[PDB]
């Protein structure tokens, strides 16, 4: 608990916020977000795409900072199909 980073996520069903330390790639942020979103979201979010900081990323190899995310870090999730 030395370097905390608050983040906010928007969903068509509601809103979900979380706090995690920056170090790993988006794969980490999404891993937790999707791991928790499943609590209320029965459908597999993996079949959908999520935009970070108003920007749609291709893979999760880039880090939060690599993408250019701000302190607030706002990402929205939407169903593509």
Strand pairing plus helix content: what structural class? Answer: alpha+beta
Put simply, the count of helices is: 2
Q: Tell me what portion of residues adopts beta-strand conformation.
A: 25-35%
Question: What is the total tally of β strands?
Answer: 5
Helix proportion:
10-25%
Strand order of the largest sheet: 2-1-5-3-4
The total number of structural domains is: 1
Distance between the termini: 39 Å
H and E string: EEHEEHE
Radius of gyration: 12 Å
The coarse overall form would be globular
Major sheet: size, sense and barrel closure?
A: 5 strands, mixed
InterPro entries: Ubiquitin-like_domsf
Protein name: Ubiquitin-like domain-containing protein
Organism: Trypanosoma brucei brucei (strain 927/4 GUTat10.1)
GO cellular component, one term: axoneme
Give a nutshell description of this structure:
This protein is α+β, with helices and mostly antiparallel strands. The chain has helices at residues 26-37, 64-67; strands spanning 6-10, 15-19, 49-52, 55-56, 74-78.
Sum up the structure in keywords.
5 strands, globular, Ubiquitin-like domain-containing protein, 5-stranded mixed beta sheet, protein binding, alpha+beta, Ubiquitin-like_domsf, structure from cyana 3.0
Question: How is the topology of this model organized?
Answer:
Blueprint: E1 6-10, E2 15-19, H1 26-37, E3 49-52, E4 55-56, H2 64-67, E5 74-78
Parallel strand pairs: 1-5
Antiparallel strand pairs: 1-2, 3-4, 3-5
């Amino acid at each position: 608990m030395s370097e905390t980073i608050p983040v906010s996520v928007q969903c068509c069903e509601g809103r979900f916020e979380l706090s995690v330390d920056s170090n790993h790639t988006l794969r980490d942020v999404l891993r937790q977000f999707k791991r928790e979103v499943a609590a209320l979201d029965p459908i597999n979010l993996e079949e959908y795409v999520v935009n970070h900081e108003g920007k749609l990323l291709l893979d999760d190899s880039v880090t939060l900072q690599t993408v250019g995310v701000k302190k607030d870090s706002v990402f929205v999730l939407v169903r593509k199909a």
